[PDB]
Structures are given as structure tokens and as C-alpha cells.
Amino acid sequence: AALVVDNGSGMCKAGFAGDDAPRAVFPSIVGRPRHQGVMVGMGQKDSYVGDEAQSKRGILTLKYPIEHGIVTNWDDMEKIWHHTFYNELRVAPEEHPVLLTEAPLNPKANREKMTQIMFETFNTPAMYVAIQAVLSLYASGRTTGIVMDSGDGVTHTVPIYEGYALPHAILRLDLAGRDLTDYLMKILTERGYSFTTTAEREIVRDIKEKLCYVALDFEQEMATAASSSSLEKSYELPDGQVITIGNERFRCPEALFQPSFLGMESAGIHETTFNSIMKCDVDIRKDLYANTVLSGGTTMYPGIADRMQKEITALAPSTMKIKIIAPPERKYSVWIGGSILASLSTFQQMWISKQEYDESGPSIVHRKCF
Amino acid sequence: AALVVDNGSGMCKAGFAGDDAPRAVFPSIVGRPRHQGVMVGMGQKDSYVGDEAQSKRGILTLKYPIEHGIVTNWDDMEKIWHHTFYNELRVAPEEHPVLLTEAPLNPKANREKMTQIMFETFNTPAMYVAIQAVLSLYASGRTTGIVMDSGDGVTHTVPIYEGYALPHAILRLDLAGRDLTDYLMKILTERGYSFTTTAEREIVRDIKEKLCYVALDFEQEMATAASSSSLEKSYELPDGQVITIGNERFRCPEALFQPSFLGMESAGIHETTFNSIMKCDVDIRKDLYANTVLSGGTTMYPGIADRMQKEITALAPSTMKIKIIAPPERKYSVWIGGSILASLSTFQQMWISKQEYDESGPSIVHRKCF
Amino acid sequence: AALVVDNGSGMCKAGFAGDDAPRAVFPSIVGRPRHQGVMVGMGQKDSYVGDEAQSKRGILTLKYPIEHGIVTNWDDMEKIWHHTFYNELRVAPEEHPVLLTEAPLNPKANREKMTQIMFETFNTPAMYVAIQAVLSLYASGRTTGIVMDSGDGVTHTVPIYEGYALPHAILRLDLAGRDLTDYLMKILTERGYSFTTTAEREIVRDIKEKLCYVALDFEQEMATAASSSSLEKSYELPDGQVITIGNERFRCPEALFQPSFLGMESAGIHETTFNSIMKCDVDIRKDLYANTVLSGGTTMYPGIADRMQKEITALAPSTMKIKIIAPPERKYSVWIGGSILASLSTFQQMWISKQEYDESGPSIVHRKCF
Amino acid sequence: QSKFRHVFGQPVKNDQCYEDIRVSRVTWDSTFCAVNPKFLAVIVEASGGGAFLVLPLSKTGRIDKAYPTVCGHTGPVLDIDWCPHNDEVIASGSEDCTVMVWQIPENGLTSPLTEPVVVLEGHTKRVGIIAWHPTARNVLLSAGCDNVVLIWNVGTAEELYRLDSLHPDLIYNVSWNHNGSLFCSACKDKSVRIIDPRRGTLVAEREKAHEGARPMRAIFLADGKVFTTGFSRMSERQLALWDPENLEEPMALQELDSSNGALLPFYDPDTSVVYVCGKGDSSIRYFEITEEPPYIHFLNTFTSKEPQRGMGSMPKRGLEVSKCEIARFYKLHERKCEPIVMTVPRKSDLFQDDLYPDTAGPEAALEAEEWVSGRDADPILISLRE
Numbered sequence A, B, C: 001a002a003l004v005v006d007n008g009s010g011m012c013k014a015g016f017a018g019d020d021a022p023r024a025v026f027p028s029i030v031g032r033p034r035h036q037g038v039m040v041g042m043g044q045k046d047s048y049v050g051d052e053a054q055s056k057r058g059i060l061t062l063k064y065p066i067e068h069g070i071v072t073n074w075d076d077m078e079k080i081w082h083h084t085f086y087n088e089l090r091v092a093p094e095e096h097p098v099l100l101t102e103a104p105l106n107p108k109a110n111r112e113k114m115t116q117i118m119f120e121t122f123n124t125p126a127m128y129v130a131i132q133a134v135l136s137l138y139a140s141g142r143t144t145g146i147v148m149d150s151g152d153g154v155t156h157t158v159p160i161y162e163g164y165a166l167p168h169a170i171l172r173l174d175l176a177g178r179d180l181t182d183y184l185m186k187i188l189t190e191r192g193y194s195f196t197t198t199a200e201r202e203i204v205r206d207i208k209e210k211l212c213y214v215a216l217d218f219e220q221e222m223a224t225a226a227s228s229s230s231l232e233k234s235y236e237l238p239d240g241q242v243i244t245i246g247n248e249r250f251r252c253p254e255a256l257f258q259p260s261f262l263g264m265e266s267a268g269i270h271e272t273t274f275n276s277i278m279k280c281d282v283d284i285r286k287d288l289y290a291n292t293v294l295s296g297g298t299t300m301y302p303g304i305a306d307r308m309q310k311e312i313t314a315l316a317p318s319t320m321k322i323k324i325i326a327p328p329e330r331k332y333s334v335w336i337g338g339s340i341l342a343s344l345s346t347f348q349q350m351w352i353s354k355q356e357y358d359e360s361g362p363s364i365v366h367r368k369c370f
Numbered sequence D: 001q002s003k004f005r006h007v008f009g010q011p012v013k014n015d016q017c018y019e020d021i022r023v024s025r026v027t028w029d030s031t032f033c034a035v036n037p038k039f040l041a042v043i044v045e046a047s048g049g050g051a052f053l054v055l056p057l058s059k060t061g062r063i064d065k066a067y068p069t070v071c072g073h074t075g076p077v078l079d080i081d082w083c084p085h086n087d088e089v090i091a092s093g094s095e096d097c098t099v100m101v102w103q104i105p106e107n108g109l110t111s112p113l114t115e116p117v118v119v120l121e122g123h124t125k126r127v128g129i130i131a132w133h134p135t136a137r138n139v140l141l142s143a144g145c146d147n148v149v150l151i152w153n154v155g156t157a158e159e160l161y162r163l164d165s166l167h168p169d170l171i172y173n174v175s176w177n178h179n180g181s182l183f184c185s186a187c188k189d190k191s192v193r194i195i196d197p198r199r200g201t202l203v204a205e206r207e208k209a210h211e212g213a214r215p216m217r218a219i220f221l222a223d224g225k226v227f228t229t230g231f232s233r234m235s236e237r238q239l240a241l242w243d244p245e246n247l248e249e250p251m252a253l254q255e256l257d258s259s260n261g262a263l264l265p266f267y268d269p270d271t272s273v274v275y276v277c278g279k280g281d282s283s284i285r286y287f288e289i290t291e292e293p294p295y296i297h298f299l300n301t302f303t304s305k306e307p308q309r310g311m312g313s314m315p316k317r318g319l320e321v322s323k324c325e326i327a328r329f330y331k332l333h334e335r336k337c338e339p340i341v342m343t344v345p346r347k348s349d350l351f352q353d354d355l356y357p358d359t360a361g362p363e364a365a366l367e368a369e370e371w372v373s374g375r376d377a378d379p380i381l382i383s384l385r386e
């Protein structure tokens, strides 16, 4: 059976092809102790990967080997892959083909080192790199539509019509969940809450996933939060302290639609989606309007689909039907679509075999993978 | 003394008729601050135009009032024209006739507003619109030949025989230097270089103007760049970072001859020039083959004349003599030709006087200007 | 005449706008007796503020109302403000506008209570709250540069280019002079010197200001101090005892560049300044490198400017000119810049007058102050 | 030294500003806003024809997209003006070559108003200048691109006087004098003229007041002098004070900057302070005119970060006297109207008699029939103490 590994910037999802849900889902972190161990004879490892690092984060410095969809520490990345195959899936990577995912418009050396590591370190019999947005369309059972995949590091839009992708219409933003987490940390200081360490960043990320939401009308929502305490919510820190946040619940997700909150000059996700559609041919814009698909964990805020529909409707012509497809399991759309593609009989000849890599080097991935 | 203003999509060239070179050349940009001023008592303007915006682009959002030879922001246009007359040339436009340039097959409302603005905002005594490709033939001292003018927004070919233009044979492409800037902007991500902001686009344009060239044989040049580092060049960013580019030097200009690189269905500039010649009468094709004139900044790539001659020779019959005329000052051919035209004694009667605009409105430009 | 009050975590600097130096500089402490008075008829007050508490610290418990730039005791803060206006400056606060200073990224309720106390307790006709780092740039006569202000509670960097601040690039550290003073107390125990009381902490602070310095190479300075007594210095305690310190002279300031000495996960002041520059756009980094300004009392260590230049040079590209500006009066740069700002004619429209407070409440400070 | 040396602008919060307003994009350089102590009128962009939004001052915050507007003109509206003697009557001129006078209900508009009370037709092309008579009741002045100034009796829909042989080129603006007996006008030929409408004569004229081809303004002051804004050859914006008796040389001439956009002067007779507002600028400069040289004293400048598309000045009767406010400006952005309050910082909270002299009331001194006969009366002054 094939292996499907979706390597996001923040979270690693792994499983077997043919399954409907990932078997191993854990954070994509590597933690190392920043203090001195004084207990002799108890098992201190040099580093912790995944859930163990998350549970021991009090005495660790958490590092993300993937930043903005680009691996910045390949030694740390091998640890995560080694943990995935041997500790999470508990399989031998040399016996199963591996299907990996990558964001579009990535550096070409990123997927070449991915090819070299898979074939030389893990000795995978076959390997393939797929675009995350393309895989999301597989999970929805569609051949036409524009997918706005937004995870922890990358927010990209890939429009596809009748099984054909438009590479010139692909747009990529470096604004994602991690930037929202950092923005939430900055605005939480307005209420006196100070989070600075890498471990405290994980606490704020948990706050963001539990209390944040997207406001249908940001200006009206700000007025409501400034006149009453109905929108205030409470969160309990691991040490027992209780924090309360008000307008920060919808201000942090608002940076997706207003990147100027972070000092970025780029357009919001609604305009990026609209611009990608407008870059396509006129005859296919109607189908893309009614088949807008959301993917990734960043699009999991309550009310994000209603806001996206409202924003694009104001931009698109009034005669087009704007339909935002936001399945309840869209956090795993990339993996589920990868599971479907890896099980297709017509996909078995698209694998990059060991023989092909041996006679062409790591550069073979640019010829066989889109 | 008449004024010659060549308002291209990227650059504004202005000067006096009878001169051999423009007196003022500055980028056609208008920049506005995107941050908040915190220092009081400093002479911070609301917007910056031309060179000042280029020097302060680190804290500005640069906007081009012209997109594809069409003015999309008329309010920003009056800023550039005001900057041209009063800050660059330091002359009063109400005392000098103004000769303006426009690309062929432009919207009729584009040149009507230019006529209205000149007469009502600047109160010019006389005014005229000339086709850019026609002016380039004046600079070369010719009355017969086809002019391939390629600037920042528009690439167009205008064939002229014995002083008579063939309007049915005029071809226009929306592929120009700005599209090449965006293409190099996209393909630089393959090496990990990330440029996103409008200020960073100006840096990418400077890289293109200094390191890019046209390969005589694209496929052979691909092999050479993939087998050695002899074609690699280094460029230092404003912050001191050094970047190295290889095959991207000649892949970016190749989009002119292979527009499919940008997802466009149109033919290359070599085929567009040949198609314009083929649309002409058979008895005049021989003269047009030997008098092909290049103009505009997008034709300043090294080796573009040799490539154009090689491509047109393959299309034209073997018995025709293909001669590509690429003067070293072809970046200012449009202005130089306008300088020659405005100084002719026979041209003084084709000015659109104020009395004609008053009794006919802005629509007079469609009767007196070709 | 406007009043400029720079309330840092450790020291309170007050004076009149237009002057070149503060008129009153006293410690920001409030002391209360911890014993029982047995002398009847003696002028024993309930509490002592400023120099009076410092002189009587033997029988007092010194408390700092400001901790890390955040006021933790507003009742004690009113005593210091009352002592400033009536005992130090000897003026009526209701007759002069008051300009206050605050560190960036502070809790929003901190400057709201400052607004409320100034208008309701002292009845100031007008007030304004300014960022300390922005004021330091005023004193140096520059409109472009990054200021690393390090005082007693907060170390923060604010980059400014052409009068425009980059809020997204502002970094703040909770490591400052007070943390170094506590670190010096901890490492003084290695030589048998014990300082535990609040009065003894002030003694250690005096030792730090007189004998501590920044070593150009920390590891090399370790070898020199462990091989001879050339670096050893003597200090006389108030009771006549003489203490001698060796490597502790440059170990305490080293915690600024190596925060791991205090168990902190944050980066050093050299990396924080570099990281703030890297968060800015590429076109302005060159100007920020050559205009790095040091401010605050924590930057008064001998050799800190040389060390900062050496550390930033290693991080910055070799083609950049790293220039550290460390004026000899940088301990009062925040106040001096505030004096200049409060005297500007263009600043007179930025005051928050008494009228706006009555029609807006304390929340007016968030829409009229940066 | 003056009390007006300290005047500073404080914009109101967003909740008192008026948002969601499609401000009209007409190139014509008019105020684009008319405000009285009762309503706020803003020229808006209409899909068909022309319309302007009239709303009560209380209706702050977001403005309904389908809010009924005054849509009666077949072309976009160029200028609007509230009647000084009736807060519920407004006049408007458009490119449909006609002037329509409207009656706004006390509570505002519930349905889109289309039918005007009177329709004045005397022009061949667009009318961009509308000026109510300061004293005479029901007397309105209309000036269009046809270089003719017409006096309208809105009460009877009758054209009292016609003057077409006075302007040889485009007219920029028309400003009535103090008592309404004369009016100044700036023409495209760089000439400033003072015209008596009841006699059809040219009282005074100054050719080449400014040496700039850019548009120039000219307004009448309370003392009878003319304040003009214009450009030089190098587009240097200038201010000039002219005495009608002596027009050979200006009393004062001061250069401001080299920016584009015409300077629209807002003059307050009670304070003798002119507020110079330039179209497209982000700053408002105020100057004090006195009898002491150089007769134009720069006080200060209110600065902002947003260019303004229009500007409206609220009269004295609608100002907050108890807060020492002497001017209120409704800055028009592209999609928002932001009132800006001019104030004089005063320690006392009592009434300032010096800051608020007697101002012209909403009661007309004369009527249309009496004004024709040559009768003149100064505006009826009221008190602001109440």
C-alpha cells in the first residue's frame, strides 16, 4: 500500500492510501532542551519530535524545520520523517511508495532535496510530489474549481478547469496561520498578556483555534465589542491563570482579509481568489465562481465561508452565482485527496521509480511532477 | 518651441522640439505612503512622482497610471504631467504646443481625455497625438519600413510604405516589458528569491535591464546553462544581499518570442512582425523586409537584433534580404522622431488649435490625428 | 511652557520643554518604614519618594511602581508624579501641558490610566503620550534610523525611515538594567558577597554602573581574567567593607547579548536590532544599518558600541556599512527628544486637550497617540 | 497677537462621521458639499442622471446604500447651496442646463425626491455656479459655462436680470458682497471683475491678477476687499488681497507651495479668518486678514493623512458655542464625510463675547421686489449667547 504524507509548515499528516483519514497527525516541531539536566540515569533524549516535544515544551526550544512551505533545516526535517515512518506509522519506508505534497511556486531545490532524501536516506521504492491545492480538488470529487489552500505557512490558489490547471493564474501568499498566531501574540499584549517563548507560542495557537472567528462585517463587529461584553470569552492557561479576550477574537482572523494589519502590501485572500479567477480565460470564470473550494486548517474559523462569499460577491459580477464549498473535513482535504490519487489505477505509471532517479539524479522530479 | 512628451507605460520622456535627446526621463510612477508618519515637522508629501518615488520606494506603494498603453488612473496622470512641465522641464505648458504619443488600436476615450486635459487643465495653445511607431520611422530618416515598437505596456507593428501607413496591417500585442518583469518576478522564486512588493518589482526590473539577454538558439542555450556555470551572473540587492541567476537571464526575454511561457495564446514578436508584413501588398513586402526597425526599451536586450533576423529569415522567402535596423539610441527613437516631426515647417498646420477644440470638443482628435 | 516627564522603570526625568537637560532626575522608588519608630516628636513621614527614600533606604522597603515599563502600583505612581510636580519642578500641573513617554507594545490600560490621572487628579490642560524610541531619534537630529532604547525595564527597537515608523518591525524585550542588577547579585554570591534586601539591590546597581563594562570578545576576556588580576577592581561598601570583583565586571553586561545566562529564550540586543532591520523592506535596510542609534542608561557600558558594531557586522552582509551612533548624552536622549518635540510649532495640534477627555473618556489616547 | 493665533483642528470620532457615501467624481472644482444647521447635502455619483444625498445631521455612522436621494436632474449635479433664509430649501445646478430648487421635509427623505419646487431654465450649457443672495429673499444667482450670470426669483420663477456681455471666457466662481449689491467673479482670462447686477455695469476689473493658467478664485470680504487665490507661471499657489478702490497693485501677495489643485477659500466674516482648502490636498491653512501689514497673517495649518474630495463649512448658527468652536468643516473623502472642528482653546468655560459677535440671522432683510428697486439692507444680525 502507498503512503501519503502531507508536510505542512506547522502540522504533519501521514497515513495509508485507501484510508479516509490520516492515521498519524502530530505537530511538525523539533524540540531540544535549553537547560542542564541534573538527574542521572533517567532517559533524556537529545531531541523530541512531534507530540513528545509538545508535552515537554516547558523545558524545550521548539523549532519548525518548515517555514512558509520551504524546509529551512533538512537535518531536523529528516528527524520528523524518521519519526513519522518508524514511530507513528511503524512501517518500513523502503517497502511502500511515498506520496509527498508541496506548495506551488516553491524553490526548485526544495523538491530536489525531498527526492534525494526519500531515495538515499529512506530508500523508498517510488516517490512523487503533488501540489496541495490540486489534491484538495480530488477530495471534493470535482474536476473544475478554484481551490484556496491556506495552512500554517502558505496560502495559494490554483484554478482548475476540466482537469486542466492554469499555471499562469496560480497565486501564492506567504500569509497563513503562523502569521496569524504571531499577530495574535502582538495584540494580546494590549490586555497585558505576554507570550514570548516558543512554548508560549503554542499556547496562543491553541487560543486562536478555540476562540477566534471571522466577522461578517468587521466594522460593525468592532462597534458591538466596544459597547458590550457579549463577545468576551475566557480561556484557562496551563498554569491555571484565566485570560479574557474581546475584539481580538475577530481581529486576528481579519488579517487574512486585510494583510495591511501585518504591514504586508499584498491583497487579502478574497482578492487573491478573485484575481486568480480573473487571470483565467473568460469562458471558465463562471464555473470557477460556483466551485470555490476552501482547504487547510486556516480556513477552519467559524463564519469564514460566509465572509468569503460576501467579499467575492461584491467583486464578481452580480449575475454570477458565488458558491463557497467548505466541507467540514477540509482540514484533511489535502491528505484525503492524496489518498484518492495514490489509489488510482491510472496513477501507478506516474511514480518516480528508483531506476529513474538513479539514471537522472534529483533533477528527475522537475520532469515527472507538476 | 514645441514640447514633445512621450508618455509610455513605464517611462515618461519629455523635452523640446529641435533637440536630439530628451531633457527629462523619469519613471512613470506615483507612490503614496503605506505607513504612519511619526515624526512631526518633516516635509512629508501626500504622494511622490517619478525619481522621488523611486528613491523613497521603501515606504511607498508604487502605482502606474498607465497599464498597457491605456491610462487607468487619470487623477494620477495629471500628477505626472504636472511634474513633467513644472518640475522637470520647468516650463509653462500654456505657452508651448505639446506633442503627445499613443499606441495604435487604443480606446477612443483614452485620447479624448488627453485632448481635454491638455486644453482644460494645462491650457495648451496647440496639441497633437502621434502614433509611437510612426515617430520611430522619423528618427531613422526613412519613409518606408515596418516599425516594431515594444515598450513597457504595448508591443505594436506599423508598416509604412512611401509615407503611407497600412492601418489594416497594424498588429498590437499586450505583451511588453512589464509582463517580462512579472515573468522574471515569478521564475526568480525557483532559486528561493522572493519578491512580492511593488518596490521589489522595481528591483526585479533593474535586474532584467542589467543581466538579461536574448539567446540566438534558446534550446542550445538551455543545454549550455545546464552543463556549466559560465552563464551565471551575480547581482547585489540594495540591502547588500548577493543573488545569482543562471538560465533566467535568457528565459525572461524568451517570452517575447514564445508568449506561451505566460499562458498567452498570441504569437511572438518575430511572428507578429512577419504577419504584419504578410497583411501588406505583395509589391511592398520586399521593401519592408529590408527596413525592419526596432524601437522601445524592450528591444534593448543584447542579441535581440540577431535573433529577430534569424526568426524572420526562417519565415520569409530565402530570396528576400532581411535587414533589422536597431540603432543604439532606439530607446529614445519615439521621442527623437517626435522632436523631428514637431520641428517640421509642414507640420505647423496640423496642430489642434484651441479654437478648434472649443468649437468641436474632445472629439476633434479623431479627425485631425491618425 | 510644556512639561516633559520621562517615566522609566528605574529613574524619573522631568523638566521644561525647550531646555537641553532635565531639571529633576531622581530614582522612581517609593519607600516605607519596615520598623517601628521610637522617637516622639520627629518628622517621620509615612512614605518617602525619590532621593529621600534613597538616602534613608537603610530603614525603608523600596518599591518600584513601574515594572518592565508597566505600572503595577497606581497609588504609588501618583506619589511620584505628585513629588515630581510639586517638590522637584515646583510648578502647578494645571497650568502646563504634560508630555509623557511610554514603551511600545504596552498594555492599552496603562496609557488610559495615565490619561485619567493626568486629567482628573492633576487637572492638566493637555497631555500626550509618546514612544520613547521615537523621541530618541528627535534628539539625534535624524529622520531615518533604528533606535535600540534600553532602560531599566524595557529594551525595544523601533525602526524609522524618512519619518515613517514600521510598527510591524518593532521588537520589545523584557530584559533591561534591572534584570542585569539582579543577575549581578546572583553572581556576586560566588565570591561570598550576599545582597538580598531592597536597599542592598541599590548598592549592587551602583557597583554595576561603576565597574561593569562590555568585553569585545567574551571568551578571550574569560582567558585574561582567569590568568591574571589585571581586570580586578575594588569597591567600597557604605559600611566601609571593601569588595573585589574580577570577571563579574563583564559577565553582567554579557547577559544583554546572551540572554540564556538568565534562563531567557529571547535573542540578544544585537540580534534583536538585526531582526528588526530584517523585518523592514529591503530598500531601507541600508539606511538603517548606517543609522543605528543607542539610547537609555543600559547602553552606557564602556565598549558596548564597539561590541554592537562587531556583532551586527557579522550578521549583516559584508558590503553594508555598520555605523553605531552612541552620543555621550544618550542616557537623556528620550527626554531631550521629548523637549524638542514639545517645542515644535507643528506639534501644538497633537495635544490631547481637556475638552476631548470630557467628550471621549480615557479612550481618547488610543486615537490621538501612536 | 490675536485670539485666533491658537486655532487647532480636531476631527470627530468615526461614529459621528458619515460613511458609505458614493461621492460624485465630477471633474468640476466645486465644494461638492452644502451643510446647514439642519441637514447635510453631499453630491453623490448616480448611475443615471444626477443626484445628491441629503440627510439629517443626526444620521451619522454608516449610510444606507439604498438611502433615498434627490435625483431629479437628467445629468450629474455640479454644485449645491442651501438657502440662507430657509434650512429646508436647497438649490442645485447640473449639466442638464437647468437649476432645480428643492424642498426637503423636516424629518428628511423617506422616498427618493425627484420633483423639485421650481425649475429655472436660462442657460444653454452646464451650470456650475449657484449663489444665493445674502439679504434679498428668494433671489438666486446662476452662472454656467455660457459665460452668463442670471438672477432668479425662485418664489416666482422669474428671470430678473441677464448679464452675458461681461465674461469673455469660462467663469470660475461668483461671490456676493456684504450687502448683496455687488458680486465678484474670476474668469478663465485671469481677470477679476466686480459687477453690479442691478445696473449691468462693470464696477471694477483687474486684468492678470495671477500669472497662472490654473483656475483662480475670488471672494468678497466683510470690509469690501477681495481675496483671491491663484497660481504663478511655475504653478506656485498664491494668495492676494485687493482693494477695489486701488487695483493697480495687490495689497498683499504670498506664495504657498507648488502643488496642483485649486484653492477654495472659506471666509468667516465674524472672525475675519479665511480657510484655504485645496482640492486633493490633505491640509487646511487658515489666515487672518487685518488692517495691519502684510494684511495676510499665517496662523497655523491643520494637517491630515488623507486627500479631500470636497469641503463644507457649517455656518455660525449651527456651531457649538459652549465649546469655543468657531468653524466646523465637513471634509469629504472618496467614501466618507469627516467633520473637522475648528476650536479656540480657552481656559474659561463661560461664553466668549469676543469670539462670537453678532452674526447674520436666518431672516431675510429685504425681498425680491424691493431689491430690484435699488433698496439695500445689511443682513439681520442675531446673537449666539442663547
Ligand SMILES: Nc1ncnc2c1ncn2[C@@H]1O[C@H](COP(=O)(O)OP(=O)(O)O)[C@@H](O)[C@H]1O
Residues within 6 Å of the ligand: A006, A007, A008, A009, A010, A011, A012, A150, A151, A152, A153, A177, A178, A181, A205, A208, A209, A210, A296, A297, A298, A300, A301, A331, A332
Ligand atoms: N479550528 C481551527 N481554527 C483556526 N485555525 C486552525 C484550526 N485548526 C488548525 N488551525 C491552523 O491551521 C494551521 C495548520 O493547518 P493544516 O493545513 O491542517 O496543517 P499544515 O498547514 O501544517 O499542513 C495551524 O497553524 C493552526 O493554527
Ligand SMILES: Nc1ncnc2c1ncn2[C@@H]1O[C@H](COP(=O)(O)OP(=O)(O)O)[C@@H](O)[C@H]1O
Residues within 6 Å of the ligand: B006, B007, B008, B009, B010, B011, B012, B028, B150, B151, B152, B153, B177, B178, B181, B205, B208, B209, B210, B296, B297, B298, B299, B300, B301, B331, B332
Ligand atoms: N537595457 C534594457 N534592457 C532590457 N529592457 C529594458 C532596458 N532598458 C529599458 N528596458 C525596458 O523598457 C521598458 C520601458 O521602455 P521605453 O519604451 O523606453 O519606455 P515606455 O515603454 O514607458 O515608453 C521598461 O519596462 C524596461 O523594463
Ligand SMILES: Nc1ncnc2c1ncn2[C@@H]1O[C@H](COP(=O)(O)OP(=O)(O)O)[C@@H](O)[C@H]1O
Residues within 6 Å of the ligand: C006, C007, C008, C009, C010, C011, C012, C150, C151, C152, C153, C177, C178, C181, C205, C208, C209, C210, C296, C297, C298, C299, C300, C301, C331, C332
Ligand atoms: N553608567 C552606567 N553604566 C551601566 N548602566 C547604567 C549606567 N547608568 C545607568 N545605568 C542603568 O540604566 C538603568 C536606567 O537607565 P535610564 O534608561 O536612564 O532610566 P529609565 O530606564 O528609568 O528610563 C538603571 O537601571 C541603571 O542600572
Ligand SMILES: [Mg+2]
Residues within 6 Å of the ligand: A007, A008, A009, A132, A150, A151, A152, A296, A297, A334
Ligand atoms: Mg496544509
Ligand SMILES: [Mg+2]
Residues within 6 Å of the ligand: B008, B009, B132, B150, B151, B152, B296, B297, B334
Ligand atoms: Mg515607448
Ligand SMILES: [Mg+2]
Residues within 6 Å of the ligand: C008, C009, C132, C150, C151, C152, C296, C297, C334
Ligand atoms: Mg528610559
